Amino acid sequence: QYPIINFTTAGATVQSYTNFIRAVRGRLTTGADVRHEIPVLPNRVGLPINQRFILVELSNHAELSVTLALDVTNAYVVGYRAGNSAYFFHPDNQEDAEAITHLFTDVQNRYTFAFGGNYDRLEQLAGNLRENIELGNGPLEEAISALYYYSTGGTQLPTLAISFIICIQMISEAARFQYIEGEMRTRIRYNRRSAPDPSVITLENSWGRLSTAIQESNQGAFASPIQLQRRNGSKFSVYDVSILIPIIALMVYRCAP
Numbered sequence: 001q002y003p004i005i006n007f008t009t010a011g012a013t014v015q016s017y018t019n020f021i022r023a024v025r026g027r028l029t030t031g032a033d034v035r036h037e038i039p040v041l042p043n044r045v046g047l048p049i050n051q052r053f054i055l056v057e058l059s060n061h062a063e064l065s066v067t068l069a070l071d072v073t074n075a076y077v078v079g080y081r082a083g084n085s086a087y088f089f090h091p092d093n094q095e096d097a098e099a100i101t102h103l104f105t106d107v108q109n110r111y112t113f114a115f116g117g118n119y120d121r122l123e124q125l126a127g128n129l130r131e132n133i134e135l136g137n138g139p140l141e142e143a144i145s146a147l148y149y150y151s152t153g154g155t156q157l158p159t160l161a162i163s164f165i166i167c168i169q170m171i172s173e174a175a176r177f178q179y180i181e182g183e184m185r186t187r188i189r190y191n192r193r194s195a196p197d198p199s200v201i202t203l204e205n206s207w208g209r210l211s212t213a214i215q216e217s218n219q220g221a222f223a224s225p226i227q228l229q230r231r232n233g234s235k236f237s238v239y240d241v242s243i244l245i246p247i248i249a250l251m252v253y254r255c256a257p
């Protein structure tokens with residue numbers, strides 16, 4: 001079976017969340033490939049199927065549970081299981097369509113959505129941009145509940161998109177960036193619910209671009225600057241890998257060292 005990591009919103013804390021995100025990182029990559037001190041996720045090309053996914057098992061105080069499937073090469077959430085039903089986003093290609101057939105093979109019901117799981121599609125379905133969708137333990141507890149009830153007709157599709165958007169950021173983006181991990185920890189700590197600010201959003205949007213520039217850097221110096229965004233919306237340039245060490249935790253594979 002694929003590796004399983006567990007988290008619950010029941011009595012969640014900064015530490016239990018931190019431990020969770022650590023475990024997820026530890027399974028996403030062995031971490032034997034490190035450029036400029038940043039771990040690289042494993043390459044898509046040679047990767048066999050028994051090693052391509054991890055399962056993230058989310059439960060509530062309501063005592064209902066849901067299992068997300070993460071693509072190991074990108075921490076991308078490709079689908080999920082709730083009870084006897086399993087749902088997948090529209091894959092990008094037949095390689096991927098093929099891969100996902102080894103997931104949740106024992107569930108009595110399997111569905112592939114007509115829509116992919118990129119943010120923009122999900123936003124159009126949710127009827128809300130990321131910047132207007134609250135994150136925190138409350139939202140995550142709500143997200144898990146919405147996903148659980150989808151198969152029985154009790155969750156409208158927009159709410160399902162909203163819930164996916166929450167899970168992706170609190171899990172896959174938090175694993176991608178210590179920065180976003182820290183953002184969620186603060187909300188857990190103070191029991192607060194808030195949309196992500198432009199520093200979070202722009203990091204999410206530019207993860208691919210940042211992976212390329214780091215791996216193509218000249219001893220850490222980017223071949224050209226990457227504009228990011230501060231909390232207050234203003235644009236600033238990063239020129240080197242060093243500034244990002246405490247900010248990005250993982251990188252998609254871009255090429256060989």
Ligand SMILES: Nc1nc(O)c(CCCc2ccc(C(=O)O)cc2)c(=O)[nH]1
Pocket residue numbers: 074075076077078117118119168172173204205207208
């Ligand atoms: N379902 C889902 N899971 C995710 O982990 C994300 C992360 C957003 C950053 C991202 C960066 C690159 C890709 C890609 O081209 O495969 C996808 C997403 C996303 O956008 N949607």
